[PDB]
Symmetry: D2
Subunit: 478 residues, 4 copies
Amino acid sequence: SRLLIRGGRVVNDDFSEVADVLVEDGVVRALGHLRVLDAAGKLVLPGGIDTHTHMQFPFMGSRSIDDFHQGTKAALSGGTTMIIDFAIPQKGGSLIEAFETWRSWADPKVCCDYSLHVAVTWWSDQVKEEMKILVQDKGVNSFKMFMAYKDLYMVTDLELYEAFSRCKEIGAIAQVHAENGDLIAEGAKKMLALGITGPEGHELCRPEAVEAEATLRAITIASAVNCPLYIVHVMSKSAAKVIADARRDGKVVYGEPIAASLGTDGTHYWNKEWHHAAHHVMGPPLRPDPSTPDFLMNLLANDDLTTTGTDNCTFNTCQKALGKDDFTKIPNGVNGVEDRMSVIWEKGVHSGKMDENRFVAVTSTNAAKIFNLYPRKGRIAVGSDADIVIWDPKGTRTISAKTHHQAVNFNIFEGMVCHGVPLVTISRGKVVYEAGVFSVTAGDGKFIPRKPFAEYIYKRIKQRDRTCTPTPVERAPY
Amino acid sequence: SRLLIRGGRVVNDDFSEVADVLVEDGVVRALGHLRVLDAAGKLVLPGGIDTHTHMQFPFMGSRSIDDFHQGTKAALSGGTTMIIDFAIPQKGGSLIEAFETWRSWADPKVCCDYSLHVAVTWWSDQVKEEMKILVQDKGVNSFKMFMAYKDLYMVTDLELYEAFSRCKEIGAIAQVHAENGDLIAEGAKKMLALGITGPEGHELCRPEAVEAEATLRAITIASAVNCPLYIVHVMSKSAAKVIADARRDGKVVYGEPIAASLGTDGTHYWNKEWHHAAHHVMGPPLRPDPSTPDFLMNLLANDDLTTTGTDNCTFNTCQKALGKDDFTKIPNGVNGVEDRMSVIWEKGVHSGKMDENRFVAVTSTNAAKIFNLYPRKGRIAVGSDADIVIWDPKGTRTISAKTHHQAVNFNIFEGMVCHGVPLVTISRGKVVYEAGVFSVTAGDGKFIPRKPFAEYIYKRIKQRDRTCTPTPVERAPY
Amino acid sequence: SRLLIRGGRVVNDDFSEVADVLVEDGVVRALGHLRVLDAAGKLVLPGGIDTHTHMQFPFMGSRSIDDFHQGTKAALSGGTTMIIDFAIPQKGGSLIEAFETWRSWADPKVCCDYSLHVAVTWWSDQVKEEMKILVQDKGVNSFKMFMAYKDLYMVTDLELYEAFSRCKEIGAIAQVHAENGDLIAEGAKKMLALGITGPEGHELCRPEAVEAEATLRAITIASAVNCPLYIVHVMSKSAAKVIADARRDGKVVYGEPIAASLGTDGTHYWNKEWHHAAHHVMGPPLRPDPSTPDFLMNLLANDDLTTTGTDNCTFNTCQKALGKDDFTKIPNGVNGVEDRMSVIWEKGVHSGKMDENRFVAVTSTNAAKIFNLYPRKGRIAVGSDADIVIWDPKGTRTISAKTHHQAVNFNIFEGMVCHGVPLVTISRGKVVYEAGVFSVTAGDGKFIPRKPFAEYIYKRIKQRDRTCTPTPVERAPY
Amino acid sequence: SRLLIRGGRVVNDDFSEVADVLVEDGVVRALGHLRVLDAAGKLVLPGGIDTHTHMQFPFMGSRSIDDFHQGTKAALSGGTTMIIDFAIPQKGGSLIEAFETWRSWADPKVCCDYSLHVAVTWWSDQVKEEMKILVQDKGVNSFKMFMAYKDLYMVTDLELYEAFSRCKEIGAIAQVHAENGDLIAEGAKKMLALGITGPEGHELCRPEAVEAEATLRAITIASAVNCPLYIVHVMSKSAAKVIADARRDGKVVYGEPIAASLGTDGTHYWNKEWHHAAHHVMGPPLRPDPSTPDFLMNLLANDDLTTTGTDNCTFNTCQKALGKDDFTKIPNGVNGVEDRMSVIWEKGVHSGKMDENRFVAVTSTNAAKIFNLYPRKGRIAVGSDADIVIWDPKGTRTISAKTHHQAVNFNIFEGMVCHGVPLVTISRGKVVYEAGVFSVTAGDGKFIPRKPFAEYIYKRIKQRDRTCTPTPVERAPY
Ligand SMILES: [Cl-]
Ligand SMILES: [Cl-]
Ligand SMILES: [Cl-]
Ligand SMILES: [Cl-]
Ligand SMILES: [Zn+2]
Ligand SMILES: [Zn+2]
Ligand SMILES: [Zn+2]
Ligand SMILES: [Zn+2]
Ligand SMILES: [Zn+2]
Ligand SMILES: [Zn+2]
Ligand SMILES: [Zn+2]
Ligand SMILES: [Zn+2]
């Protein structure tokens, strides 16, 4: 019922100090200098917000083995107290129907708080209306549109134009999967026609130019409509370089690198054992440039990239095996939900690239601001939800598929020694993870709704309507 | 019959020296230290090759007043001895039919040598075949595809993919008009709905982001197919910046800035008199950034941009007036064919940005190499065609619509004082322009055919097939 | 004694909400939803922190007319409640002596809170020691070194190396004036030898390449020593572009653009009236590129540049006249202290480039974090000092030397219409400015000391010692 | 006496065609379609010009084992028919004396034609005068200045300013070794104080930021004086990126990457065997970024970098051993003179990055133009010197220290399989290398003098004096 985190160092996005945290009924009630936790010499961080998960997802052939129960269980064991999953309807399928379906899958299963993005996979007047209802009635402020996945989720530039316009009118952010779907389709034919059936052909048919082209296109469509943009799972230096320069030019665009692209690379597609390479297959692919994790982390520290996801969409080895003779038939997706925090602490904080405060912003706070959850989440303050992690920076931890809490039998961070270990995870004011032991039950986590027009992204969009709308030049008629 | 240019300084792309030029039967027969021309203290340059003209073109509502006779007459008066015009078929129209039509318009009219680009305005198996015939039988090695002009010339990314693939197979270069046609259409609705009916709305509906987006897309499609790319009338810093970085990354792409974007800007769209602003309307628009001419010239000097055109598509004031209440109904196109050389000499050579040798490369030689006309044109050497200009760098010249030789009653370089005056223009070994006086008759100029697989662009494309084609990773079956 | 700001919208760096502010004994004591101020429909912002002023400074020939009383009076009338001035010793002069001198000038005069940077104008073991005392005993955490001003303040690269090393050891940030002092000296000879004695020669002898070169050098020296860097009065796109890319590469460097370079340009050096041009003379100069204010503001909004100063160093027209026949004899410095906030609100917030929250960070909060004043200043929170401005974004205001509160008889923002008017300025919990009327007395403002090792800049520097220190490669002896 | 190269494909910088070469008395006398050489299916290229060698150089402790006889013998065996070595005087030593000394070492030894750069290692009025004599009387048009090597060759920014000014007045190009000598000295102390005595400390004390900083500085000093700049042995992406952008901005600067930085990297400094790492030690160091050779080659193909050297300064294993316990005492320098052509053909031409024509420009022609040797060298034309290589692109060749013709017992390209084999090398119209066999004697090669004001670099510098010199703004006296 009551928690007292004592002698710990409370670390937020803006500031850190030595203070004590009094938690009551799921909320931080006090800060200042029946259970007491000794956090001396340790860090008291807001719980991680993973902005990108795909739990139990019927994708291509099958569903991902990490479901909303085990996936959140694994999230909590890693320091992440909130996931934002995607409600994906089929072409011609209802958006509200997909949202309700995804809720019934998650509500009784989830162990930590969660919310939902909704994908606009096709376009009509019916989609246009369903978007407004999801914002007003269901608590949705984000919509994902696909530039990749031809004949599955892909939309044209006109449909991107329309979808962004609608996002603007109803106060939602636009999310885009930036890859040229026409090039990935024609490229995949070429690779198979050349006899490259392995996972290396997956990356080879989608070089980073394809990712970067679509990224700039998304940015250009969004800028022409004055709609705030969010670029999901940024994988390449080129795509990141585009987002960085766009923001430099004053475009309202935000980049989300994932654990995968910050912790490992795409050289693993060329690995001699098929299963190793197949377990790295996702969209966009991991890049065969070993200096990518370094570059992506650098921009993230500098706020050129701002939020962090995992794109967690895990498949077993035998599940991945569905594309053993055809790389297009491999279920796309990798692990990340559990290890995100540690991977970023090790590769980002311990490496000297960013503060502990930047780490908080990058794993929690920036997500809260963008998806309108601040300061309810992403902050340890009076009134905020008690999603708290007691973090030991000094201690080490080895990532292994034999020791992790994910359902997948493979880890892309296998063997990685990470500084920063979550000793205690607190979700909704209740200790749910402590030294390998869970204190959670299914359905304890709750869906939390989000309001439109997030000030962090929309306040400067609204001014642009007022003052960047052009006016005619007064002339005499010819 | 015989010409002896004496005491002149012969300036090529690579080298310049004091030498005498002996011309016989239209060909330079000798170089070394019945008519003799005193070129002492003056420059002997290869005649300009304008890579981009649209003479007597039935565009939107009407035809351009500069036809193949007056347009070439004006070209010769400015130092340009060759034009490469565009054969534009309508959607559903035959390419060979358009080529033959454009030939019958030009052949009896042209005063200087010429050739033709052919536009791929739609896509089928019939277009696919007609492209091969134009290369084998008609002497065409270049095809223009449109990313702009929706419902008129626009093609999709798949059609760009296919059109580039065909250009590669038959040994032709791909030309692209890089502007997002979907954005220009939706943008134009917005401007008129806001009541901006003047020429300023033409630029406002197509900001340089739109040009730059399509440029990168073209480059990305071309790079994925391994097809050499040529970007016509580059207008913006952003689009030029994309081409520069693409070439830096090793992409086979060439940029063609035009006289308009090197000599003037787009601030003139905001001019108080409608006709002034309307006479600057073209696609892409001139940019409202006064530092554009400086930036474009800089890259041109550095070979980031390589060739020069004019996009000469001139309309009278009353012709332009067709869009007096609707900027979309204004015939697009500006002057340039005559003034190109002087504008570039003044803004490029006299300003200290480039050599006289770079000027030759940039107005003649680079065009020859790309369109397979080197060393027949773009060079003063034994065997080369006698397209020669005696050029005075020291003397000045004022550009005015009241004194020029173009049919258009307006000049976008009006009032510009230019160093570099063409004293004598020699076409096909015959003096055709001398101190304001013409010595030409209609049909004197001749169509010159071009062969496929230009070594300058294709030799390194052919190697990429051989060594950049990926190979499978030898693995045991799972 | 007690202030109650009611119905206002409290705007911080991270967040804004409708709340009431209870101020008691100079400190914000409460927040939540004998004098009451109606702030309905208005903004409640933390008072501006100007990071760069030079009040009553005996520079070149004379002293600046804006002294610590009138200068702070003017600061408060503009929304700035704190100034950080510079204690400049002469070559061979004591640093502690200059600090004490500058304190005795300011303490009885200042109307708002203040602190001091100290300049390292020469190097020895005595300077090395005096730096440690200023940090331990005097509350200094910042030192300015000069790359410009030969034979006056300039230090060599070795001395920059040593000065940065000392800043690191004692926990202070290094400030640098980035301009090549050797080039500015040789350049100034050339201009006068050419007969350019006017203010245009001041800019012409120091093109932005000179500023950019020194900026990169400073960054390189600082990076090699692992010392946090601060670049004062950034004036050019090139210098800003260097800082932006440096931070992108993970260098600990911060950029401070000034009101002058955000509100006006350097085209004014070419103005027909001498006094106009002379009143724009400073180091580095304002740039003759009209698009500079736009570019600098853009990066500032994006956090590529982070803090804001004014370099306020104002001279009367007749004072500036000392260099009427020799631009080197013109007292360098321009106005800014009063107008900073409004200039940035108009050019930055109202233009749609940044949030109101970003504006707070950029005029106050980021300064606090860097110079270790957060959250005591730059934030409206329980415990923070009551430096508060009631700000009207809707209302307008014209800047004029005839209506401003600065001692200088000239304003470089003359005629600028600015949105964002300070209705009420609160300093140390006391209303000191209200609708043109002052409620302050001399010496009311107080010097506030700063502690070393500011977590915002040093926490990631300290990690780099631990993990970026190289180790030998274990080898057998040859 | 007479050579007839038959059925070969003559490849120049601008053009290639099937033709026959008639060589008489050391000069190409004819081109068109007692010894005849069958060059069918092979390439006829101009002989390589290596712009950077240091034969038999008393550097640090000893002299390099490759002397002017064996070094040129090795050059010819690789396809290089000309070397341009450096005459390095000591501080206080005469420049003309060093030039004459270097001539007496080379004249009786050299097997191929050569010329000399002269280093300005110190500055006075005596150096100032000696520079003019070397240009007028000795045939020197290039001077190397050092930003690195403190207390040995280093000069200050003022001395760089003066040295560039003199280069301009006498019509010579300025060469600079761009590395911050103050940082390399302080860095080297730090590494040894940390106990890093191996070759890895050589690179670690000079990260590429140091190289890049000095490069930009050199460019800035040169641009302020209007003196043409040449940057020797470019090693890093950063330094190359600076040169590329400088040229893009219109600065007259040329970059010279070397065989070492195009063929290998600096990861070899971390090799477990000391001798391996020591044999890679040079200034600036090879970079620990494996993607460097790729990036440098890319820019070279694009003309961002233009010429090619080797910095050939070879030491035996036991010679290098002088710094076995102190990396500062290792004789700096690596091999390259022989393998340059093949390394560049393999990594540049065969890889599809550049043409065969670009290869000619990059190994020969561009050097000729810059150092005023065109078209006498770098071109196969009537009148040009018969420095010719019959080149087989189809055939392969393995580089090994056991099979090469250099005196050094180590090769940094060891094991590299290279396409492009020199079958026949012709020097001064005489076959000197054929299938492993030499037909040369010592002193056969001859020193060839160079004239000042090379049109390729100076024609646009001279215009800048005329039109970029600022003029006063006409004003009334205040
Ligand atoms: Cl478990
Ligand atoms: Cl006429
Ligand atoms: Cl007053
Ligand atoms: Cl031998
Ligand atoms: Zn996705
Ligand atoms: Zn996803
Ligand atoms: Zn066009
Ligand atoms: Zn056109
Ligand atoms: Zn300063
Ligand atoms: Zn200052
Ligand atoms: Zn060197
Ligand atoms: Zn050298």
